[PDB]
Amino acid sequence: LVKIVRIETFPLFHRLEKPYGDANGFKRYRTCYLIRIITESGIDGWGECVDWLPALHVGFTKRIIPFLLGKQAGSRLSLVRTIQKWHQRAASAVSMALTEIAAKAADCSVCELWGGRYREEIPVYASFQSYSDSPQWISRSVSNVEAQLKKGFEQIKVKIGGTSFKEDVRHINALQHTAGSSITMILDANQSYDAAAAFKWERYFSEWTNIGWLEEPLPFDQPQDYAMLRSRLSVPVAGGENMKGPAQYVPLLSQRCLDIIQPDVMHVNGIDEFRDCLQLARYFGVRASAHAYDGSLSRLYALFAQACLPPWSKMKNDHIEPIEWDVMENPFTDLVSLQPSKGMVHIPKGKGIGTEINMEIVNRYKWDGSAYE
Amino acid sequence: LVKIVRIETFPLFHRLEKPYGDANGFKRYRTCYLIRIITESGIDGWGECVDWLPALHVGFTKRIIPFLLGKQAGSRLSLVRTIQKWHQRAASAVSMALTEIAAKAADCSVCELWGGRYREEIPVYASFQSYSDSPQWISRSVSNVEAQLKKGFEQIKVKIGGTSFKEDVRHINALQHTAGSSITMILDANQSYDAAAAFKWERYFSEWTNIGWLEEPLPFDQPQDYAMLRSRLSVPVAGGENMKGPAQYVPLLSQRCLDIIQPDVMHVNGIDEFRDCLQLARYFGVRASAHAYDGSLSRLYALFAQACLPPWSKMKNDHIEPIEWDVMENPFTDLVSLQPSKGMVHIPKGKGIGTEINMEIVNRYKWDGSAYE
Amino acid sequence: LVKIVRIETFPLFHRLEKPYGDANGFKRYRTCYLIRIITESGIDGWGECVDWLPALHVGFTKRIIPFLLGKQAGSRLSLVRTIQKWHQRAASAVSMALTEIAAKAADCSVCELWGGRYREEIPVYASFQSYSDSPQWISRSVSNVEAQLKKGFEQIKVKIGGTSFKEDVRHINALQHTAGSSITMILDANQSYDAAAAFKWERYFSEWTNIGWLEEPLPFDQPQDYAMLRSRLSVPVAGGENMKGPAQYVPLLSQRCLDIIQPDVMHVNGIDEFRDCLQLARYFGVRASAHAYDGSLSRLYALFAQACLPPWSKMKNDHIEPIEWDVMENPFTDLVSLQPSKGMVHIPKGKGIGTEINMEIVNRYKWDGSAYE
Amino acid sequence: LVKIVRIETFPLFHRLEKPYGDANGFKRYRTCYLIRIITESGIDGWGECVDWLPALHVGFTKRIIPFLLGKQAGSRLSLVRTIQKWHQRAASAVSMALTEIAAKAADCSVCELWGGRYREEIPVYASFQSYSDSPQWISRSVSNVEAQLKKGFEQIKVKIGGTSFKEDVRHINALQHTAGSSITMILDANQSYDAAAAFKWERYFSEWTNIGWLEEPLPFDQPQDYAMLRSRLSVPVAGGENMKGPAQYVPLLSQRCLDIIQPDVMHVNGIDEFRDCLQLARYFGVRASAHAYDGSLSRLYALFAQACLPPWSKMKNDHIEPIEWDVMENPFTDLVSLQPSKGMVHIPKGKGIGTEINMEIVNRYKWDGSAYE
């Protein structure tokens, strides 16, 4: 029954050396917002969220923190529920810090808190923001992908739908010729297309044997269009990274819209809601591969969640979905000291989250408090 | 700490002084099967299941126990999932025992283990096996109901569908005149009917203001008949107590078959799958009221689960569903010293399950090993 | 392995003393066509069909009999299958004679041949052809119904849809006032109506408590209209007496068109196909009440079939559907000596069909071979 | 004549010399449970079921046998329906025994009891448990298949879905090169996949001309996923071996889920319910090919049933579906002395089941009462 006594906030900001992006445009910076909740006993817990920092920082300092102080850290479901009404993304960060506190007070790991892992290794794919601001963007993308293939990644994700079909195809072709067919390739459209535009890829999908899935080809306004497209393509369709929770997945799965859902710990209403998304997928007989582009601490929670997820198939060697691993310039990957080895992540087994937040990163990237174009 | 070293079994049996029943026939006895899992550190936990005792006992002693000895008690998800292949009922009892151990090892209650409760009290309804083997069965039922109303139950469930509509209407009318409109009445058909037979009640549902729901009017073979009937009645329709897990509820809910689902901790694959049933209902926007007719220790788990469930409505004093409380002759109701007052059950707050199994009852009703019927 | 050696035919004809009818018009005569198949061993079997006698008699004498002679009586499925291609109604008669032969050669009853009865008593309703050729048709119908109520029939079927709604209502009202609410009344429209015309009865159905079902309100060209109407009425909808077999029921049941199907032994492809219709209904969760207006020997087979049918409900006193019992002038009711007693028929238990064909009737009503307006 | 006076039980057990399996894991032993029901007159009959022997044996000796003693053997429908409540598996064995008794008492074969056969020979396919515990599992499977092809099997079934697509394709390719296009190949996934995983085979189904069907690609939780996948593949889809009866097939067929249903005599509620499964398929216009992997005496019943089934097509030499023939190490294949020649099984024509249970095998493999695994 140990009360919350203090909460520290760490808005983080990093201007990118070279911009990159996807169909929505070029990213110029990366941000992160960490929280540390400290209880009466001294047991503490960390959380992570990502949103526009001026608005996010006041959400915490002016409303969430004053609410949380003096509250019972153990009333996790209740506290996260009430905060969800003010800022959903903040709510996810709080849910992480409170889970860490719980696991520590219980003297166990987070996976143990959840009833024990099924496995201690989780596959990851290298996730690229393939567009850059250069006429030579295709050759640079090819070089970047080659670099990561050297590291033993066997699965990659790259961007499409930001330029004409003809030009995207040239890019994908160039990657096929370097990577070869033993590398699995995922193509992310970031909702650029309509059904007919997406379908133009089918003639290539008919030939290629190494396409993992087609990701977010369409916006979600018309679920029936997803069901339509899915039944026409020769590769799996994934999506849903901007869904807010299990309730929003339910009708997409009832309508047979997707082969793979992709909840993001930070977009849904916290880690328990996130785990419910994964289970929902299992119950509907569909796959789940977390979106985690902006995560590091949150990404570790997605890995814990995957480790506690039952197999999706009876294939001895192919029965757990990979998680997204951002491979672009981003110092926040080091907030936790955990990296893949040959496309595989080994789950920390220690108490709480089994690892520590890298304070050098926290300190180096302290946000200067200013508005950032 | 938690390696499993010993498992004790307690088959229990009670011959009824006076038989009672429902549309499936008369119950002649009650049974219960308790297990006590003991770990290396001495931390123990209890589970309960119910099935025909000769076959259940051999399943534990010859398959389940030999498998569990030497296993790590904290690998709850994994172990339950493995046992679920040989025996779902057994897996449920195992899940409960492992949950108690987990909470004890964590030095918290089961509800705190799950992220903390939303509330401290849960409503219950008095559940009756209304039919007796007697021409005077209606008068008897009336007397039985009046007895429980004196204890301040505000909601009851009684049986229909075992005899002609005309005679069942006589029974219900008699109850209506004695209990009056302050008392909520739940009618349970136990799958006796087809849509047209069930629909005959509508002309009375048109007049009455105090029907809680119509329970299991039909078998579940044809889900579409449920959606059809639902749209025709003036009262909610509940069921699904014999569904084996959340995956079985999914198509029913996608098809808008039920107003209320009624999972049973002992019929689904364990306490975590049971809790997933309740979450699934919430995400589909349907109500969830646990079936708990057999069961005492499993009934306690159903109450913990309901305490950790967010509200179903925004009504200040009508936003959590009741749980079933068997009010018929059954000594196993005392296995756990928890009873409702004025139709409300206060949830135990102490470490583990916050209560002790009554060894007096366990010893008194030891099954003597004889086969029955 | 006993061959068919001889087959005798008995076209029967009876001019009605006073014509009666339904929405299709007045019946002026009744006909019956009996067959007797005799095997090498002397074991014989009877069958019954009903169709226009000139065409039916040549179907037998010129094609079916010459086919059947020298065939193995025991190859029932095969022989009935092949004859179905020439004349379906004849095929039913053959299937009956061959079943009788089988039961006799096996030294058991027909019910035993089928794996034993569930019960030995079957409820029947008195079935009226309510229209007569008189301004006083309502008073005569009232008198006819009163006469049968004296015999202890508790359920009746009468005709509607042959005249304006206003006039039919006057007739039904007159019957309600004599019979009272302890008599169950069935209303047969013989496909007179469209959805809107049928629905006009709903205002009366809203008031009456003793309506068994509404029978064949619409033609079957548009199954969706049945599904539509069923969901709007306050009484069950029955039909399907002109369906040719199980395959034709399947889509009506998949579309939730009917509460009760009504196969006719003589319209479907013989008795095994007929029993399959009954089982199909059970599997779809719907009721089955045989059409049997023109049957006597065939009616007995419908009774055997009902006796071998599992209950439709869990109601101790209401779990088997009645069969149709023609109560109009018709000497062929006496072809077999079996009559209801207070609305209940007791199934003959003896070997073969447990009864004999009444040869006095066969002889008295020999068809004179002439065309009959 | 047929009062039941004695019932003898024969649990049987065989430890495999070399384990084999499918995507669910490796089989280590085979079991069989035979019953012999003896009537007052000395007429007896046999039944077979398969389940975990300690629990199955107690179910018979303590519940089923005590119920049957003194009952009339000719009340087959009733007795089977009562037993179906305690134990479906047991009811199946009981149904078989009572059917043999019925046919014997009738002095005819089982097929004649059912109305006579349509045909005297039924095609079978060699069914393999393709996976072995060995790096050389592919070569072994190839050798095993070649061995059976030498016996003139023209159709085989092999296992997929237990390992990665890539490795399963290697296995199937190896089989294709050895067996060639004259041999029909059936691929059985044992519910390993989701739709997208199953659909990966389509690019090979596009090339191959000799695939019989794809068996159980998916679990049956979401029927709509089957209809979806069916419309995308170039080969028929079969399944349903774990459906409990015709009522469970109805929604699958209404929804156009399957090209082929695969009832199992021992998994449904008896031989009459099994035959209803096959009839249901015919009325829905779908194919029916019995699952018979375990079973020898029950396999014989499946063959009798198929001999009494009308053709599925109008193709002179391709109008009856094959039945499964287990070709793996299993001494219980000889319990009944019936084997295929050149992939065809000739149906026994003699009274009762036309054959004797091999008491040498029954005695050799007597279960010693020890619990296993």
Side-chain angles (χ1 to χ4, degrees):
Chain A
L1 289 148
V2 176
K3 290 195 190 171
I4 298 171
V5 305
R6 175 179 167 82
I7 306 178
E8 305 175 335
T9 60
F10 307 87
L12 309 171
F13 181 95
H14 173 250
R15 201 172 293 97
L16 288 168
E17 199 164 46
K18 292 170 198 172
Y20 43 73
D22 60 24
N24 287 315
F26 298 123
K27 296 154 177 63
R28 315 245 157 217
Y29 52 82
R30 301 295 299 270
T31 65
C32 182
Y33 190 106
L34 303 188
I35 71 178
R36 180 205 182 198
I37 300 181
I38 304 113
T39 71
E40 211 157 18
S41 60
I43 294 175
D44 61 354
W46 293 82
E48 178 185 77
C49 55
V50 164
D51 213 335
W52 179 59
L53 300 167
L56 188 52
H57 191 47
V58 318
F60 274 102
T61 52
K62 300 302 188 66
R63 179 143 71 159
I64 295 159
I65 290 171
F67 168 79
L68 281 172
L69 298 180
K71 297 299 182 303
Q72 279 299 112
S75 300
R76 180 178 78 253
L77 295 183
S78 180
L79 294 176
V80 170
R81 179 182 179 76
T82 89
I83 288 153
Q84 276 154 5
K85 288 176 195 153
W86 302 325
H87 201 301
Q88 174 142 333
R89 300 245 195 104
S92 75
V94 171
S95 79
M96 289 178 229
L98 301 180
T99 297
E100 193 181 349
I101 286 161
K104 281 172 165 183
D107 196 32
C108 61
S109 70
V110 177
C111 287
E112 279 169 346
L113 187 75
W114 294 341
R117 63 192 218 16
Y118 290 91
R119 66 194 67 76
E120 75 180 290
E121 284 200 288
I122 303 291
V124 293
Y125 66 88
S127 186
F128 296 88
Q129 301 282 143
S130 316
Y131 301 116
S132 64
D133 195 21
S134 169
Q136 291 275 58
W137 77 270
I138 298 186
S139 61
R140 301 175 185 209
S141 170
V142 177
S143 286
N144 287 351
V145 166
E146 291 182 337
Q148 303 297 325
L149 297 177
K150 303 291 150 58
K151 302 186 178 194
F153 283 97
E154 289 161 44
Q155 312 193 54
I156 68 175
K157 185 169 84 186
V158 293
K159 306 312 201 185
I160 65 157
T163 188
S164 72
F165 178 75
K166 189 173 92 304
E167 183 174 10
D168 278 335
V169 162
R170 284 202 266 272
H171 168 42
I172 303 308
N173 277 347
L175 288 183
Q176 282 292 19
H177 298 130
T178 318
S181 65
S182 68
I183 301 317
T184 292
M185 191 160 331
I186 300 158
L187 305 181
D188 184 357
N190 296 101
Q191 307 185 11
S192 182
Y193 301 145
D194 63 12
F199 190 73
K200 291 172 70 174
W201 285 91
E202 182 48 29
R203 51 182 240 245
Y204 293 97
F205 293 154
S206 286
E207 286 302 292
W208 291 332
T209 59
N210 66 327
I211 303 307
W213 62 81
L214 176 60
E215 181 165 319
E216 296 232 320
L218 324 171
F220 284 84
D221 307 311
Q222 299 275 145
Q224 286 300 125
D225 292 335
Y226 263 95
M228 188 177 62
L229 185 63
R230 186 184 173 203
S231 76
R232 301 195 74 207
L233 292 176
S234 279
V235 308
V237 182
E241 71 192 56
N242 297 146
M243 302 298 139
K244 295 205 168 293
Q248 295 183 18
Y249 289 108
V250 169
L252 307 174
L253 301 187
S254 294
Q255 299 177 72
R256 296 173 309 269
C257 300
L258 295 164
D259 295 279
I260 304 145
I261 65 169
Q262 301 181 288
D264 171 354
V265 179
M266 298 192 293
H267 205 262
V268 306
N269 293 292
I271 187 52
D272 300 309
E273 185 153 286
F274 179 83
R275 297 191 65 234
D276 285 346
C277 291
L278 303 184
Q279 225 57 229
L280 176 73
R282 282 290 178 277
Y283 292 134
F284 256 102
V286 306
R287 284 184 235 173
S289 174
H291 180 75
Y293 192 72
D294 290 312
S296 72
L297 182 58
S298 64
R299 176 168 67 199
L300 174 61
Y301 278 95
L303 291 167
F304 291 156
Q306 207 63 358
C308 295
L309 198 66
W312 70 267
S313 83
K314 292 170 195 193
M315 287 185 277
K316 221 63 172 54
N317 286 328
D318 186 22
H319 67 252
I320 195 66
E321 303 92 323
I323 284 189
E324 181 178 23
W325 201 276
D326 178 16
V327 293
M328 303 309 294
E329 162 188 356
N330 176 14
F332 308 128
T333 199
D334 284 332
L335 279 165
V336 293
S337 303
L338 182 54
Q339 292 295 327
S341 168
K342 295 168 297 185
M344 299 286 325
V345 174
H346 301 58
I347 303 304
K349 283 193 299 227
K351 287 159 180 186
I353 63 166
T355 193
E356 311 218 282
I357 299 298
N358 187 338
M359 287 301 295
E360 311 199 53
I361 314 284
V362 174
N363 292 149
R364 180 171 296 115
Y365 302 96
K366 169 171 187 211
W367 174 50
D368 62 19
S370 94
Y372 51 89
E373 216 241 286
Chain B
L1 220 31
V2 288
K3 177 156 303 165
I4 299 160
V5 297
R6 208 146 53 80
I7 300 179
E8 291 167 7
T9 62
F10 311 86
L12 307 176
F13 181 85
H14 175 253
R15 196 192 169 154
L16 297 175
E17 274 138 63
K18 286 173 189 57
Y20 44 69
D22 63 25
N24 289 316
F26 298 119
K27 294 151 172 83
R28 307 275 176 208
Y29 50 80
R30 304 300 293 281
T31 71
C32 179
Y33 192 104
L34 299 189
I35 62 171
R36 184 208 178 197
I37 297 182
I38 306 109
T39 68
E40 279 201 331
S41 59
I43 293 167
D44 63 354
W46 292 83
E48 176 178 77
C49 54
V50 177
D51 213 340
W52 183 61
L53 293 168
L56 189 57
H57 195 58
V58 94
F60 273 104
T61 69
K62 310 300 193 45
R63 273 215 293 194
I64 300 151
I65 297 179
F67 167 73
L68 291 172
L69 294 179
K71 298 296 183 296
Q72 284 301 136
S75 294
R76 188 176 77 246
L77 298 182
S78 177
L79 293 171
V80 168
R81 158 171 272 257
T82 304
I83 305 177
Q84 267 159 9
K85 297 181 213 299
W86 312 307
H87 206 308
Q88 97 170 338
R89 303 272 189 173
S92 176
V94 171
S95 83
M96 288 175 226
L98 300 181
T99 299
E100 186 172 355
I101 291 168
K104 279 179 181 193
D107 198 30
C108 65
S109 64
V110 173
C111 295
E112 294 171 313
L113 191 67
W114 295 341
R117 69 198 158 255
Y118 288 101
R119 70 197 57 84
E120 281 65 72
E121 333 179 332
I122 304 295
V124 292
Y125 62 89
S127 198
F128 296 90
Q129 308 275 146
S130 300
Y131 298 119
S132 48
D133 207 327
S134 162
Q136 290 311 294
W137 78 266
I138 295 177
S139 49
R140 315 275 204 65
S141 167
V142 179
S143 296
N144 217 38
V145 173
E146 286 174 351
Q148 303 297 318
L149 294 179
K150 282 171 199 315
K151 312 212 215 176
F153 286 101
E154 280 178 41
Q155 299 199 38
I156 72 179
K157 186 173 75 187
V158 300
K159 304 312 194 187
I160 64 166
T163 194
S164 70
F165 180 74
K166 167 199 82 293
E167 185 172 10
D168 279 330
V169 169
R170 286 190 296 253
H171 175 216
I172 303 313
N173 277 339
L175 296 178
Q176 285 293 23
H177 302 134
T178 314
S181 67
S182 69
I183 301 303
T184 301
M185 194 145 345
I186 301 154
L187 308 184
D188 181 357
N190 293 103
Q191 306 183 12
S192 175
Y193 297 143
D194 62 8
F199 180 81
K200 283 169 74 166
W201 287 89
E202 177 59 21
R203 79 161 154 116
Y204 293 93
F205 297 159
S206 279
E207 64 186 332
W208 295 330
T209 60
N210 69 333
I211 306 296
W213 63 80
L214 175 63
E215 181 153 327
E216 300 236 326
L218 327 171
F220 280 90
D221 300 303
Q222 295 284 129
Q224 286 303 121
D225 292 331
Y226 263 90
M228 174 185 279
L229 178 62
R230 180 183 180 197
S231 63
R232 303 211 58 196
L233 302 173
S234 291
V235 302
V237 180
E241 70 197 47
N242 293 151
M243 302 299 136
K244 284 214 153 81
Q248 287 184 27
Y249 282 109
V250 172
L252 302 178
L253 298 189
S254 285
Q255 297 169 65
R256 305 179 309 282
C257 299
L258 299 169
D259 296 281
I260 305 157
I261 71 174
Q262 299 187 288
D264 190 303
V265 175
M266 292 196 282
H267 202 268
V268 308
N269 300 305
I271 188 51
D272 301 306
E273 285 208 34
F274 177 86
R275 293 191 67 228
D276 295 341
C277 295
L278 309 175
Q279 293 302 311
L280 187 66
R282 283 294 178 273
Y283 295 136
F284 264 98
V286 300
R287 270 177 258 167
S289 168
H291 174 85
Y293 190 72
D294 294 306
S296 174
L297 177 60
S298 63
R299 178 163 74 195
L300 180 56
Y301 278 93
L303 295 155
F304 289 153
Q306 202 72 354
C308 291
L309 197 54
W312 72 273
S313 80
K314 297 178 184 191
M315 289 186 284
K316 133 178 287 305
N317 47 21
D318 189 17
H319 60 247
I320 190 64
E321 307 91 325
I323 279 174
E324 179 172 35
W325 200 273
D326 173 18
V327 290
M328 309 304 294
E329 178 199 339
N330 181 358
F332 310 129
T333 190
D334 289 334
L335 278 171
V336 149
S337 322
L338 188 53
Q339 295 294 321
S341 342
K342 301 175 302 291
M344 297 294 312
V345 174
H346 302 245
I347 304 295
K349 295 195 249 206
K351 309 202 198 157
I353 65 168
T355 193
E356 308 265 46
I357 301 294
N358 188 337
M359 293 296 302
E360 293 189 10
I361 309 301
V362 163
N363 299 152
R364 186 177 300 117
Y365 304 93
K366 177 184 185 179
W367 176 48
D368 65 0
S370 58
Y372 38 93
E373 53 86 57
Chain C
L1 289 148
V2 176
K3 290 195 190 171
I4 298 171
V5 305
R6 175 179 167 82
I7 306 178
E8 305 175 335
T9 60
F10 307 87
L12 309 171
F13 181 95
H14 173 250
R15 201 172 293 97
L16 288 168
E17 199 164 46
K18 292 170 198 172
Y20 43 73
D22 60 24
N24 287 315
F26 298 123
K27 296 154 177 63
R28 315 245 157 217
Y29 52 82
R30 301 295 299 270
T31 65
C32 182
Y33 190 106
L34 303 188
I35 71 178
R36 180 205 182 198
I37 300 181
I38 304 113
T39 71
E40 211 157 18
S41 60
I43 294 175
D44 61 354
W46 293 82
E48 178 185 77
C49 55
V50 164
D51 213 335
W52 179 59
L53 300 167
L56 188 52
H57 191 47
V58 318
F60 274 102
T61 52
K62 300 302 188 66
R63 179 143 71 159
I64 295 159
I65 290 171
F67 168 79
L68 281 172
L69 298 180
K71 297 299 182 303
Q72 279 299 112
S75 300
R76 180 178 78 253
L77 295 183
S78 180
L79 294 176
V80 170
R81 179 182 179 76
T82 89
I83 288 153
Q84 276 154 5
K85 288 176 195 153
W86 302 325
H87 201 301
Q88 174 142 333
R89 300 245 195 104
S92 75
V94 171
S95 79
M96 289 178 229
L98 301 180
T99 297
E100 193 181 349
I101 286 161
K104 281 172 165 183
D107 196 32
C108 61
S109 70
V110 177
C111 287
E112 279 169 346
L113 187 75
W114 294 341
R117 63 192 218 16
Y118 290 91
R119 66 194 67 76
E120 75 180 290
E121 284 200 288
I122 303 291
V124 293
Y125 66 88
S127 186
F128 296 88
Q129 301 282 143
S130 316
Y131 301 116
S132 64
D133 195 21
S134 169
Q136 291 275 58
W137 77 270
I138 298 186
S139 61
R140 301 175 185 209
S141 170
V142 177
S143 286
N144 287 351
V145 166
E146 291 182 337
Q148 303 297 325
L149 297 177
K150 303 291 150 58
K151 302 186 178 194
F153 283 97
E154 289 161 44
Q155 312 193 54
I156 68 175
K157 185 169 84 186
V158 293
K159 306 312 201 185
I160 65 157
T163 188
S164 72
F165 178 75
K166 189 173 92 304
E167 183 174 10
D168 278 335
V169 162
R170 284 202 266 272
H171 168 42
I172 303 308
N173 277 347
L175 288 183
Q176 282 292 19
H177 298 130
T178 318
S181 65
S182 68
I183 301 317
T184 292
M185 191 160 331
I186 300 158
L187 305 181
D188 184 357
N190 296 101
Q191 307 185 11
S192 182
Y193 301 145
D194 63 12
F199 190 73
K200 291 172 70 174
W201 285 91
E202 182 48 29
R203 51 182 240 245
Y204 293 97
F205 293 154
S206 286
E207 286 302 292
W208 291 332
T209 59
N210 66 327
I211 303 307
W213 62 81
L214 176 60
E215 181 165 319
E216 296 232 320
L218 324 171
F220 284 84
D221 307 311
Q222 299 275 145
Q224 286 300 125
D225 292 335
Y226 263 95
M228 188 177 62
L229 185 63
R230 186 184 173 203
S231 76
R232 301 195 74 207
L233 292 176
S234 279
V235 308
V237 182
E241 71 192 56
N242 297 146
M243 302 298 139
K244 295 205 168 293
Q248 295 183 18
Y249 289 108
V250 169
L252 307 174
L253 301 187
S254 294
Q255 299 177 72
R256 296 173 309 269
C257 300
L258 295 164
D259 295 279
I260 304 145
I261 65 169
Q262 301 181 288
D264 171 354
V265 179
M266 298 192 293
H267 205 262
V268 306
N269 293 292
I271 187 52
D272 300 309
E273 185 153 286
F274 179 83
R275 297 191 65 234
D276 285 346
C277 291
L278 303 184
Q279 225 57 229
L280 176 73
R282 282 290 178 277
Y283 292 134
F284 256 102
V286 306
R287 284 184 235 173
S289 174
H291 180 75
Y293 192 72
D294 290 312
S296 72
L297 182 58
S298 64
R299 176 168 67 199
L300 174 61
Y301 278 95
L303 291 167
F304 291 156
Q306 207 63 358
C308 295
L309 198 66
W312 70 267
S313 83
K314 292 170 195 193
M315 287 185 277
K316 221 63 172 54
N317 286 328
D318 186 22
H319 67 252
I320 195 66
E321 303 92 323
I323 284 189
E324 181 178 23
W325 201 276
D326 178 16
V327 293
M328 303 309 294
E329 162 188 356
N330 176 14
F332 308 128
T333 199
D334 284 332
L335 279 165
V336 293
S337 303
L338 182 54
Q339 292 295 327
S341 168
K342 295 168 297 185
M344 299 286 325
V345 174
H346 301 58
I347 303 304
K349 283 193 299 227
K351 287 159 180 186
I353 63 166
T355 193
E356 311 218 282
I357 299 298
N358 187 338
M359 287 301 295
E360 311 199 53
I361 314 284
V362 174
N363 292 149
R364 180 171 296 115
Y365 302 96
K366 169 171 187 211
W367 174 50
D368 62 19
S370 94
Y372 51 89
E373 216 241 286
Chain D
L1 220 31
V2 288
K3 177 156 303 165
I4 299 160
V5 297
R6 208 146 53 80
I7 300 179
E8 291 167 7
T9 62
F10 311 86
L12 307 176
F13 181 85
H14 175 253
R15 196 192 169 154
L16 297 175
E17 274 138 63
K18 286 173 189 57
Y20 44 69
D22 63 25
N24 289 316
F26 298 119
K27 294 151 172 83
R28 307 275 176 208
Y29 50 80
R30 304 300 293 281
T31 71
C32 179
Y33 192 104
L34 299 189
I35 62 171
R36 184 208 178 197
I37 297 182
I38 306 109
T39 68
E40 279 201 331
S41 59
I43 293 167
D44 63 354
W46 292 83
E48 176 178 77
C49 54
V50 177
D51 213 340
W52 183 61
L53 293 168
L56 189 57
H57 195 58
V58 94
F60 273 104
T61 69
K62 310 300 193 45
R63 273 215 293 194
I64 300 151
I65 297 179
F67 167 73
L68 291 172
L69 294 179
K71 298 296 183 296
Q72 284 301 136
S75 294
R76 188 176 77 246
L77 298 182
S78 177
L79 293 171
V80 168
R81 158 171 272 257
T82 304
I83 305 177
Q84 267 159 9
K85 297 181 213 299
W86 312 307
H87 206 308
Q88 97 170 338
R89 303 272 189 173
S92 176
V94 171
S95 83
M96 288 175 226
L98 300 181
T99 299
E100 186 172 355
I101 291 168
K104 279 179 181 193
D107 198 30
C108 65
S109 64
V110 173
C111 295
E112 294 171 313
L113 191 67
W114 295 341
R117 69 198 158 255
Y118 288 101
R119 70 197 57 84
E120 281 65 72
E121 333 179 332
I122 304 295
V124 292
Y125 62 89
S127 198
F128 296 90
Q129 308 275 146
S130 300
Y131 298 119
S132 48
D133 207 327
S134 162
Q136 290 311 294
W137 78 266
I138 295 177
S139 49
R140 315 275 204 65
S141 167
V142 179
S143 296
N144 217 38
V145 173
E146 286 174 351
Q148 303 297 318
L149 294 179
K150 282 171 199 315
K151 312 212 215 176
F153 286 101
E154 280 178 41
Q155 299 199 38
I156 72 179
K157 186 173 75 187
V158 300
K159 304 312 194 187
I160 64 166
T163 194
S164 70
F165 180 74
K166 167 199 82 293
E167 185 172 10
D168 279 330
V169 169
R170 286 190 296 253
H171 175 216
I172 303 313
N173 277 339
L175 296 178
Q176 285 293 23
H177 302 134
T178 314
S181 67
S182 69
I183 301 303
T184 301
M185 194 145 345
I186 301 154
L187 308 184
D188 181 357
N190 293 103
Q191 306 183 12
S192 175
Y193 297 143
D194 62 8
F199 180 81
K200 283 169 74 166
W201 287 89
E202 177 59 21
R203 79 161 154 116
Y204 293 93
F205 297 159
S206 279
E207 64 186 332
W208 295 330
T209 60
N210 69 333
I211 306 296
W213 63 80
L214 175 63
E215 181 153 327
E216 300 236 326
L218 327 171
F220 280 90
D221 300 303
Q222 295 284 129
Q224 286 303 121
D225 292 331
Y226 263 90
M228 174 185 279
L229 178 62
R230 180 183 180 197
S231 63
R232 303 211 58 196
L233 302 173
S234 291
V235 302
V237 180
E241 70 197 47
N242 293 151
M243 302 299 136
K244 284 214 153 81
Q248 287 184 27
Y249 282 109
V250 172
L252 302 178
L253 298 189
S254 285
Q255 297 169 65
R256 305 179 309 282
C257 299
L258 299 169
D259 296 281
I260 305 157
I261 71 174
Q262 299 187 288
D264 190 303
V265 175
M266 292 196 282
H267 202 268
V268 308
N269 300 305
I271 188 51
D272 301 306
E273 285 208 34
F274 177 86
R275 293 191 67 228
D276 295 341
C277 295
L278 309 175
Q279 293 302 311
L280 187 66
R282 283 294 178 273
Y283 295 136
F284 264 98
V286 300
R287 270 177 258 167
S289 168
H291 174 85
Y293 190 72
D294 294 306
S296 174
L297 177 60
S298 63
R299 178 163 74 195
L300 180 56
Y301 278 93
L303 295 155
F304 289 153
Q306 202 72 354
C308 291
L309 197 54
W312 72 273
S313 80
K314 297 178 184 191
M315 289 186 284
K316 133 178 287 305
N317 47 21
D318 189 17
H319 60 247
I320 190 64
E321 307 91 325
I323 279 174
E324 179 172 35
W325 200 273
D326 173 18
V327 290
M328 309 304 294
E329 178 199 339
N330 181 358
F332 310 129
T333 190
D334 289 334
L335 278 171
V336 149
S337 322
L338 188 53
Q339 295 294 321
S341 342
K342 301 175 302 291
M344 297 294 312
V345 174
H346 302 245
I347 304 295
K349 295 195 249 206
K351 309 202 198 157
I353 65 168
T355 193
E356 308 265 46
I357 301 294
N358 188 337
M359 293 296 302
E360 293 189 10
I361 309 301
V362 163
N363 299 152
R364 186 177 300 117
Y365 304 93
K366 177 184 185 179
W367 176 48
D368 65 0
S370 58
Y372 38 93
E373 53 86 57

